[PDB]
């Protein structure tokens, strides 16, 4: 693997061979065109799961949801040439993406009608039926989270790469709680590290110890980060990790910051977050023992737009911990208002 690089601080240009990890999170777009195994092997596996009491699908990531949306039309074109009364209905994802107990089966044989090669030029749009196979949406009443498959796809051996436009997926035969290793890239060079995949970009630095520097998440997965793809996994207390392990945070010494524990009650309902270490605009933080204890994260603006300007903490270090979502700036679990009653603030209502 060949390439050339430029460093803009220590002005320098270089070329050679090596291993390169790219930032595909910022400016994520339609870089990949996803397809399942075969048009008739997915239809057979979906049909069998419906006859085994599985209602629908809960999506592991944004990537799987986009793949389900594109394939949905062709999938319903099959399943009618076989007389099956079943319709796949794809909705949108809500953070966090909660787990599911079931998995999709591997059909013993494909459905005996249809075509190969995902992406037929023209087919007749199928008609609606009475039976729905819902992929993650706002449909938790017609079938609950306890009858939903989750994490049943695996990226194929040569299905991914740097110069790849189409990614090949496949229904797995085993049962797992791990995040897919084919799309994870971790690298350290000198005093900077990164743990990254298609939805996370988590950076670290070395000041006196290794600490978290900033993170940018465009989804909240709930799989487990594999240890083969993690740096410095030993001697780790699970209660010191800033990004909780139940939210696919790496089990690393790089996932720590001095004076902060795990943020199980951060604003994990947002569609996109940025974890930053500095004050929010207009507010200041002091350290004093008269402050309160940890609770849910609080927004720095009230529900009517007023800004609370003075905050405190007990034994936290500066700069403070902040979450920057589209609705606003939020403080860490350890940082509480100094004068304003907490009943007048917007609080986080989710827990990892």
């Amino acid at each position, epitope marked *: 693997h060949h390439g050339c690089s430029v460093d803009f601080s220590k002005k320098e240009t270089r070329c050679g061979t090596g291993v390169f990890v790219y930032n595909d999170v910022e400016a994520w777009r339609d870089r990949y065109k996803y397809h399942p195994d075969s048009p008739r092997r997915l239809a057979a596996a979906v049909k069998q799961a419906w006859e085994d009491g599985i209602c629908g699908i809960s999506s592991v990531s944004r990537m799987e949801n986009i793949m389900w949306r594109s394939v949905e039309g062709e999938l319903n074109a099959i399943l009618e040439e076989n007389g099956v009364q079943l319709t796949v209905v794809v909705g949108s994802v809500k953070n966090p993406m909660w787990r599911g107990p079931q998995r999709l089966p591997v059909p013993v044989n494909e459905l005996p009608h249809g075509w190969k090669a995902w992406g037929k030029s023209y087919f007749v749009r199928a008609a609606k039926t009475n039976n729905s196979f819902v992929v993650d949406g706002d449909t938790l009443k017609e079938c609950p989270l306890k009858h939903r498959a989750w994490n049943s796809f695996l990226v194929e051996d040569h299905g991914f790469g740097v110069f790849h436009t189409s990614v090949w997926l496949k229904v797995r035969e085993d049962y797992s709680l791990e995040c897919d290793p084919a799309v994870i890239g971790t690298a350290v060079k000198g005093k900077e590290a990164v743990h990254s995949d298609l939805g996370y970009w988590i950076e670290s630095e070395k000041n006196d110890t290794w600490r978290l520097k900033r993170a940018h998440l465009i989804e909240m997965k709930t799989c487990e980060w594999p240890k083969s793809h993690t740096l410095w996994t030993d001697g780790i207390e699970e209660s010191d990790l800033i990004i909780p392990k139940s939210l696919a945070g790496p089990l690393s010494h790089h996932n720590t910051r001095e004076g902060y524990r795990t943020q199980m009650k951060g604003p994990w309902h947002s569609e996109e977050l940025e974890i930053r270490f500095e004050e929010c605009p207009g507010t200041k933080v002091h350290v004093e023992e*008269t402050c*309160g*204890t940890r*609770g849910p994260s609080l927004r720095s603006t*009230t*529900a*009517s737009g*007023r800004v609370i300007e003075e905050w405190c903490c007990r034994e936290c270090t500066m700069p403070p911990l902040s979450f920057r979502a589209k609705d606003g700036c939020w403080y860490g679990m350890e940082i*509480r*208002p*100094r*004068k*304003e*009653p*907490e*009943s*007048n*603030l917007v*609080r986080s*209502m989710v827990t990892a």
Partner: antibody, heavy 117, light 104 residues
Framework: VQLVQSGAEVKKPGESLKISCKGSGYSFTSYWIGWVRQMPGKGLEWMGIIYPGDSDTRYSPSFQGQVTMSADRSISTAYLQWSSLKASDTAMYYC???????????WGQGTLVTVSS | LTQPPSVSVSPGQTARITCSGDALPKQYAFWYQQKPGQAPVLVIYKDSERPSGIPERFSGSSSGTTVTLTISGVQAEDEADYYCQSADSSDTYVPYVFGTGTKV
């Protein structure tokens, strides 16, 4: 920590009255101070809170104007003033130390106010 | 906001007191005990926890828009009134509100 209130008062209608609540043992200006009423044989009600240091007051809608809360951060004392006591003001009045998260930690022994004629 | 006006049990039994309100899902709740002649005492804070100095037979739980105070091993020294405190957001008024009471 300690909050000490004034003595019992026996009053006639139509004059003013100041009751006090002195506190000691902690940073008096780092916490709110709440006032709670309890009529004879009834339940508790909130009369509002005052933040000493900068005398920010947040009354209850059923009490604004009819009572005035004040603070004096020099002597660590918070007050409560009437102008014309009525016959429906017979109750026990508690001062308390409120936290930012909402829990009421310490309560004063209470001041029994009687208005008769 | 709402409480049952009176309950009655026998020694050794376990009594349950109910507090109901709309804003309870997004707000904390506190429980106060007041024996006749004295000032209120905090027994349960933040819907589940106990301050140091309270017998371990006091507990509370939250289930949706309702919070319950349960007294497991009732002795004689529990004949008091129990008050529920919650909050509702504002900008110029006091956020806090007391429950009506329960004469156990």
């Amino acid at each position: 920590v300690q909050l000490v209130q004034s003595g019992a008062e026996v009053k006639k209608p139509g004059e003013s009255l100041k009751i006090s609540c002195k506190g000691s043992g902690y940073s008096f200006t780092s916490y709110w101070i709440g006032w709670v009423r309890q009529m004879p044989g009834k339940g508790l009600e909130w009369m509002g809170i005052i933040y000493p240091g900068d005398s920010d007051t947040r009354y209850s809608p059923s009490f604004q104007g009819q009572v005035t809360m004040s603070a004096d951060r020099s002597i660590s004392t918070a007050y409560l003033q009437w102008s014309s006591l009525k016959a429906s003001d017979t109750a026990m009045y508690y001062c308390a130390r409120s936290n930012v998260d909402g829990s009421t930690d310490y309560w004063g022994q209470g001041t029994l106010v009687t208005v008769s004629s | 906001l709402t409480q049952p006006p009176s309950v009655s049990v026998s020694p050794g039994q376990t009594a349950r007191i109910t507090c109901s309100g709309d804003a309870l899902p997004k707000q904390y709740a506190f429980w106060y005990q007041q024996k006749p002649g004295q000032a209120p005492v905090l027994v349960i804070y933040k819907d589940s926890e106990r301050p140091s100095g309270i017998p371990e037979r006091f507990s509370g739980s939250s289930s949706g828009t309702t919070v319950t105070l349960t007294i497991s091993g009732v002795q004689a020294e529990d004949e008091a009134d129990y008050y529920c405190q919650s909050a509702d957001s504002s900008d110029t008024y006091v956020p806090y509100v007391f429950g009506t009471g329960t004469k156990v």
